[PDB]
Amino acid sequence: VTIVKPIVYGNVARYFGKKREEDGHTHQWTVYVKPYRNEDMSAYVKKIQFKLHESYGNPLRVVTKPPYEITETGWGEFEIIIKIFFIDPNERPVTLYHLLKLFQSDTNAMLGKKTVVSEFYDEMIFQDP
């Protein structure tokens, strides 16, 4: 039996206020994949890889157990490749593309929002293991 699981994915980010002197980093950020509902996806997810930019140490980051999140600091925006592997090697990995957002849009800045959130939706489809 093939099943559908809605997921959300993307990132949050917070401005430090002032650039850290040592590395010029201006933000803390967390990239993630979550189920939409409050459930445990490690029943069907073996692992989730977050390919960070090459300026990061060991840029291929792997999370084997929830929560599926990576938290870092940074100063610039870049594309992250997210790859979800299923428990079964039958099932094709889901590949997702996400631009890491640091800088608040001017609209959300003017509405008073403290933290940036760039979140997208998807539906994972797979056979029950």
Side-chain angles (χ1 to χ4, degrees), residues 82-113 115-124:
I82 306 165
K83 195 160 189 178
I84 305 176
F85 293 76
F86 302 97
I87 290 281
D88 195 342
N90 147 112
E91 283 299 345
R92 258 71 156 111
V94 175
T95 288
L96 304 167
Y97 299 90
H98 178 72
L99 171 64
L100 185 82
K101 290 302 301 177
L102 301 177
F103 315 123
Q104 196 77 274
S105 78
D106 286 334
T107 310
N108 291 326
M110 215 180 304
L111 297 172
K113 301 196 185 189
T115 72
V116 337
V117 185
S118 185
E119 186 164 280
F120 297 87
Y121 319 98
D122 208 345
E123 289 161 277
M124 281 189 325

Side-chain angles (χ1 to χ4, degrees), residues 4-60:
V4 315
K5 293 303 192 180
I7 62 166
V8 295
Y9 68 97
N11 86 273
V12 304
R14 212 197 209 291
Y15 192 53
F16 294 158
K18 46 175 158 211
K19 81 190 312 200
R20 187 163 56 190
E21 313 92 330
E22 185 71 2
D23 53 8
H25 285 199
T26 55
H27 294 77
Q28 190 165 244
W29 55 263
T30 299
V31 65
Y32 60 78
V33 176
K34 309 180 187 174
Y36 186 94
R37 299 197 229 62
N38 194 46
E39 41 166 285
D40 182 5
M41 292 197 302
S42 65
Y44 38 93
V45 180
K46 187 151 65 89
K47 68 180 190 292
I48 299 176
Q49 255 171 29
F50 299 82
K51 189 182 182 216
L52 307 188
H53 177 264
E54 287 89 345
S55 56
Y56 282 87
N58 306 290
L60 186 65

